[PDB]
Amino acid sequence: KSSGRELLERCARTAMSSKLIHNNADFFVKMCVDAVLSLDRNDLDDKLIG
Amino acid sequence: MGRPFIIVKDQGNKKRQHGLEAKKSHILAARSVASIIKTSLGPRGLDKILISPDGEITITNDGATILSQMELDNEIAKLLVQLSKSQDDEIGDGTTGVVVLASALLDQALELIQKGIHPIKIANGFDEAAKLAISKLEETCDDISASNDELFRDFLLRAAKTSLGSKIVSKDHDRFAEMAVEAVINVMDKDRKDVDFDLIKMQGRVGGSISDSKLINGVILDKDFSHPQMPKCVLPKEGSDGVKLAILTCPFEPPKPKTKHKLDISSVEEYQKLQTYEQDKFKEMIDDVKKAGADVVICQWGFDDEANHLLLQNDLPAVRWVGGQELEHIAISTNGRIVPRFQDLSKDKLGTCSRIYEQEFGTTKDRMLIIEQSKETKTVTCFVRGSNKMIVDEAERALHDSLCVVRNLVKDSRVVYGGGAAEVTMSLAVSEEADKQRGIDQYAFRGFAQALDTIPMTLAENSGLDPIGTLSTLKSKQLKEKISNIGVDCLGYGSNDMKELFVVDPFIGKKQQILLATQLCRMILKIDNVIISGK
Ligand SMILES: Nc1ncnc2c1ncn2[C@@H]1O[C@H](COP(=O)(O)OP(=O)(O)O)[C@@H](O)[C@H]1O
Numbered sequence: 115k116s117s118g119r120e121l122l123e124r125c126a127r128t129a130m131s132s133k134l135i136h137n138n139a140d141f142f143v144k145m146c147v148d149a150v151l152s153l154d155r156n157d158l159d160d161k162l163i164g
Numbered sequence: 165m166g167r168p169f170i171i172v173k174d175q176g177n178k179k180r181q182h183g184l185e186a187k188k189s190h191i192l193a194a195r196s197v198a199s200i201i202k203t204s205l206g207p208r209g210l211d212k213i214l215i216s217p218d219g220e221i222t223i224t225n226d227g228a229t230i231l232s233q234m235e236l237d238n239e240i241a242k243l244l245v246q247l248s249k250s251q252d253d254e255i256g257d258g259t260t261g262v263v264v265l266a267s268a269l270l271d272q273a274l275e276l277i278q279k280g281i282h283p284i285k286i287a288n289g290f291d292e293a294a295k296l297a298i299s300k301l302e303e304t305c306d307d308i309s310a311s312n313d314e315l316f317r318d319f320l321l322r323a324a325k326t327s328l329g330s331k332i333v334s335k336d337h338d339r340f341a342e343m344a345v346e347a348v349i350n351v352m353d354k355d356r357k358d359v360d361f362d363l364i365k366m367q368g369r370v371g372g373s374i375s376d377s378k379l380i381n382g383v384i385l386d387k388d389f390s391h392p393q394m395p396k397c398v399l400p401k402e403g404s405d406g407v408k409l410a411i412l413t414c415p416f417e418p419p420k421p422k423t424k425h426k427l428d429i430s431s432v433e434e435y436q437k438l439q440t441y442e443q444d445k446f447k448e449m450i451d452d453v454k455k456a457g458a459d460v461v462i463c464q465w466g467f468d469d470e471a472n473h474l475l476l477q478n479d480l481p482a483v484r485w486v487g488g489q490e491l492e493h494i495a496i497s498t499n500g501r502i503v504p505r506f507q508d509l510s511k512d513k514l515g516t517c518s519r520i521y522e523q524e525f526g527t528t529k530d531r532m533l534i535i536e537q538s539k540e541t542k543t544v545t546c547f548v549r550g551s552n553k554m555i556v557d558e559a560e561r562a563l564h565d566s567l568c569v570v571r572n573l574v575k576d577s578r579v580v581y582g583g584g585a586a587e588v589t590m591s592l593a594v595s596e597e598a599d600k601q602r603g604i605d606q607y608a609f610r611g612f613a614q615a616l617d618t619i620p621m622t623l624a625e626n627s628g629l630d631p632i633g634t635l636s637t638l639k640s641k642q643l644k645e646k647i648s649n650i651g652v653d654c655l656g657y658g659s660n661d662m663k664e665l666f667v668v669d670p671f672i673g674k675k676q677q678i679l680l681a682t683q684l685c686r687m688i689l690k691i692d693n694v695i696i697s698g699k
């Protein structure tokens with residue numbers, strides 16, 4: 115019974131590894147996590163996040 | 165397995181670079197690029213001749229233009245070309261200091277790679293050390309926004325005189341610093357101020373001397389009047405000092421639809437009716453201007469031979485073949501609106517100009533239009549002269565960089581003292597934190613602190629001073645005394661204080677020097693396999 119917002123944050127920081135974001139992941143993860151929440155949970159699109 | 169071995173197409177032109185020798189080649193290559201502009205850093209810096217394949221030559225010391233329009237091969241130095249372009253676009257100043265600082269981070273990291281430390285672990289310490297340097301300089305950064313507009317005007321002069329000392333414009337910094345500051349003041353809001361650089365225009369002219377350059381508020385047009393015999397100067401009569409300038413996108417031409425059309429005329433009767441038709445159009449076009457009281461009319465397409473003299477009898481000057489972009493910049497300074505059609509012409513859309521005269525240059529045949537405003541207007545225009553075509557173009561980039569420093573103080577009033585004072589202040593802050601934490605990251609912190617010391621040692625080397633005696637003197641006054649104003653003096657004054665020398669630099673310009681240099685070298689250390697295809 116945890117929070118749904120913190121669930122997407124820990125999973126997003128994993129993909130940030132091996133990239134240039136690993137050091138800056140503090141600021142950058144807070145972006146993409148808020149990007150998926152704007153989209154509808156039923157319909158997720160990769161063209162809108164362009 | 166047979167002799168032919170093929171996986172990736174074109175294996176002959178594609179070469180693979182790998183190993184410890186790969187890091188040694190790309191780091192030492194980036195140093196040769198900074199070594200060229202190393203002597204160009206500071207007011208003692210020297211220019212660089214750039215030859216284009218078409219034969220045009222350009223002489224500039226700005227690292228953004230030097231790296232631009234230059235033939236390169238290695239991809240590491242091409243990243244430095246985009247590095248100076250990143251510093252030039254947003255900030256507009258400091259393109260030379262970033263490339264020198266970026267190569268200094270690689271030279272200090274090259275010795276750390278041979279010690280057995282992973283390249284990313286070297287780059288991970290640079291990001292943590294860069295945050296401690298910015299936080300230290302921000303604490304000692306003075307805020308000039310607490311003063312009034314009187315002291316704020318002199319604060320913009322301190323920032324302009326510093327950037328103009330490294331160019332050919334450095335002959336007189338006092339006279340040309342007003343041209344950069346006063347051009348910005350006209351577009352400033354006086355509250356929550358934004359620069360809006362689009363309103364500022366720069367038009368160069370090749371001839372005369374650079375001392376003849378003066379700030380003129382208005383629009384510069386190179387298009388001569390439609391008829392030669394109209395008076396060169398236009399002055400208002402009695403009251404209403406505005407000249408009622410009219411800007412129309414539709415010239416004087418026989419009315420026709422844009423689509424393809426065909427007009428069928430029957431014998432003599434309809435042939436004579438259309439004759440009077442157009443003869444009444446010229447009389448209708450001239451009465452609209454006289455009804456609204458307009459004087460000068462400008463348009464994209466040239467007037468007809470019958471429309472040229474029709475405006476002369478009514479004492480109505482006109483200019484033809486004006487570009488579309490030039491039409492828009494005129495209506496802003498005149499507080500007018502461009503009239504789309506002859507039926508919409510009204511006195512509310514007419515412009516206002518204090519004086520307009522026809523400029524002539526030497527024995528060459530040209531006519532330059534000069535619009536002037538007796539009061540503060542929305543736009544400004546830079547008028548630059550020079551004895552050489554390249555000096556004019558160099559004075560453009562020198563004045564452009566000065567306008568980029570002034571606009572940095574408009575958004576962020578926080579400024580720092582440059583000339584070796586800011587680099588040493590941020591360098592000693594990292595060295596103090598390296599001995600406290602110890603660990604395996606103490607070597608990455610010392611390499612970042614020694615890389616920041618390359619900038620003040622470069623300014624002292626180009627000025628003739630001893631880099632050993634200069635660097636040791638700065639660390640003595642910075643550690644003992646909390647005043648960070650002590651920095652490298654390239655001109656040789658008896659005092660090392662940067663505050664008494666009126667040397668002021670924007671904080672957003674110096675902050676991006678470490679940010680752009682640290683983020684670039686982190687990717688360079690992450691590059692192992694290098695595949696270069698021959699062209
Ligand atoms: N008169 C001066 N006194 C002290 N330092 C100066 C002076 N003029 C320039 N500098 C220093 O030289 C450095 C380089 O400035 P400049 O060559 O004008 O542009 P860029 O930063 O693009 O190279 C700046 O960081 C500045 O601190």
Ligand SMILES: [Mg+2]
Nearest residue numbers: 257258327565
């Ligand atoms: Mg500069």
